[PDB]
Amino acid sequence: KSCPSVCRCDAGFIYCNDRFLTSIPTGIPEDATTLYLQNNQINNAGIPSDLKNLLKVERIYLYHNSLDEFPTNLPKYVKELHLQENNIRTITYDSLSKIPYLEELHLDDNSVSAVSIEEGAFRDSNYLRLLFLSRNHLSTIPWGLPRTIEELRLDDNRISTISSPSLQGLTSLKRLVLDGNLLNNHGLGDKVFFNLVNLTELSLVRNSLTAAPVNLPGTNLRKLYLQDNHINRVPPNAFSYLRQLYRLDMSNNNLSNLPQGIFDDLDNITQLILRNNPWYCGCKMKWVRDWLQSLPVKVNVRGLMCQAPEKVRGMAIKDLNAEL
Numbered sequence: 001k002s003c004p005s006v007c008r009c010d011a012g013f014i015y016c017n018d019r020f021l022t023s024i025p026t027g028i029p030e031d032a033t034t035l036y037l038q039n040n041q042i043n044n045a046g047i048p049s050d051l052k053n054l055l056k057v058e059r060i061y062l063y064h065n066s067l068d069e070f071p072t073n074l075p076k077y078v079k080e081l082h083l084q085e086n087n088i089r090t091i092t093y094d095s096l097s098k099i100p101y102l103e104e105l106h107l108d109d110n111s112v113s114a115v116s117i118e119e120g121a122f123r124d125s126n127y128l129r130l131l132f133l134s135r136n137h138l139s140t141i142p143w144g145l146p147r148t149i150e151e152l153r154l155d156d157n158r159i160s161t162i163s164s165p166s167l168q169g170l171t172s173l174k175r176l177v178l179d180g181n182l183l184n185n186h187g188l189g190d191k192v193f194f195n196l197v198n199l200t201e202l203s204l205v206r207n208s209l210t211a212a213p214v215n216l217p218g219t220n221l222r223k224l225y226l227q228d229n230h231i232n233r234v235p236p237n238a239f240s241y242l243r244q245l246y247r248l249d250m251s252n253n254n255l256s257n258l259p260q261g262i263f264d265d266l267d268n269i270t271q272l273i274l275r276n277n278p279w280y281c282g283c284k285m286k287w288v289r290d291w292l293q294s295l296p297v298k299v300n301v302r303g304l305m306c307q308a309p310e311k312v313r314g315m316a317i318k319d320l321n322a323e324l
Ligand SMILES: *[C@@H]1O[C@H](CO)[C@@H](O)[C@H](O)[C@H]1NC(C)=O
Pocket: 171, 172, 197, 198
């Protein structure tokens, strides 16, 4: 039981946070389990060589430090690693090779771009399940990502493109978050989402989609968020095969008309949110009125009301008799 003077130690929990450290203290107990190193001014040269030997460390909190690249020399068996609010740009295969049992990784609020990541950095990370890259400088999705991933948060980046191979192979992915990016349908590869069998949430809030994306996986897709884009259109096959989808939101978009029977595969739809769309109730909208009346009471529909013509503005599409 030897605990560094600056820090305080209690039964494997090492509290070295908020102590203006520029370096990690040398005398860490061998029975270390969780490392509280957050809220320090720690840079990459402040990690001692002996840190690697702390073989019982499973959780490390290094958020809100001064790290400018991926920390090497971390305890060989880390499982939980929180690097948010650092200045990390570079990430190399070698660095990640050092902690191959890593399971969840928080790089939120850093300065990583796709190029600042070595190609194939993750080839050994055969246990990574959670990868959070929220609020970085990514402009695309990195080609080499481990099959084991289950959650992938990429919100508020500068992503404008998504190659097919970046997402293909992620056959375990369940949640994919691309809110707050610069995506438009030109930026989408052919079947980028197509192979994500295990996908449960797709969240594309706050981009520049002008059309509902196609070739989505319908085996498990349960929630689908498309708000705050500029979607003009629903291609005929957009919601194809989504037999498990119970939630779909296209609020704050630019839809005025729906193709006939786009919602025909939505066997499990329960929540359909279309507030703030410029719905135009003409002879093209008549099928929708029917479909609404044929819809089970269970199902919750919101915002599906006429904006045009002014004549019938604000009236529920389910309740109209005559429009043209
Ligand atoms: C989906 O995930 C479950 C558990 O995460 C796994 O057993 C299954 O094999 C996955 N599906 C595919 C096609 O990999």
